[PDB]
């Protein structure tokens, strides 16, 4: 396992969002990408179980306004430190938005906006730096 490119990560982020939005058949994804996607969804599920074991409210009263605030959330989340656990939290926030805020089972224009924002943040912040992947 090692660092991957921004190019690869842009692909991986979109496949991650389409998968959790249920707008890409497992079939239709490149195998290796489907591996990395599943790896990130599994980390997010683990991260969500710890959140849920400590806190009763879900993310849905802060993230209903992801529209103007998402980039603010993302920046606080990395202010004090960058590590892979903060990255997994970043992805679970994006998974929450797809799965409960945005219109379900669809690749709407807001999904594309979520994509851009996450992709623009992951890259501009060099998150690839703190999260290696298989092979």
């Amino acid at each position: 396992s090692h660092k991957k490119s921004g190019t690869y990560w842009a692909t991986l982020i979109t496949a991650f969002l389409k998968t959790v939005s249920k707008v890409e058949e497992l079939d239709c994804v490149d195998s290796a990408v489907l591996v990395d996607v599943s790896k990130i969804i599994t980390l997010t599920q683990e991260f969500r179980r710890h959140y849920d074991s400590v806190y009763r409210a879900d993310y849905g009263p802060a993230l209903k306004n992801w529209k103007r605030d998402l980039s603010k959330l993302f920046t606080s989340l990395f202010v004090d430190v960058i590590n892979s656990g903060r990255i997994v939290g970043f992805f679970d926030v994006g998974r929450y938005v797809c799965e409960e805020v945005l219109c379900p089972g669809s690749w709407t224009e807001d999904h594309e906006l979520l994509n851009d924002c996450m992709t623009h943040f992951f890259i501009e912040n060099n998150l690839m730096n703190h999260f290696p992947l298989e092979d």
Binding site: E46, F47, H50, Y51, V54, Y55, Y59, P61, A62, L63, N65, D69, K72, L73, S76, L77, D80, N83, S84, G85, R86, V88, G89, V93
Partner: peptide, 20 residues
Amino acid sequence: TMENLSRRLKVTEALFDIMS
């Protein structure tokens, strides 16, 4: 609300990353 979310996510990151 949002700053509060942030705080809770960092707590969660600390538990997830408890020691690694």
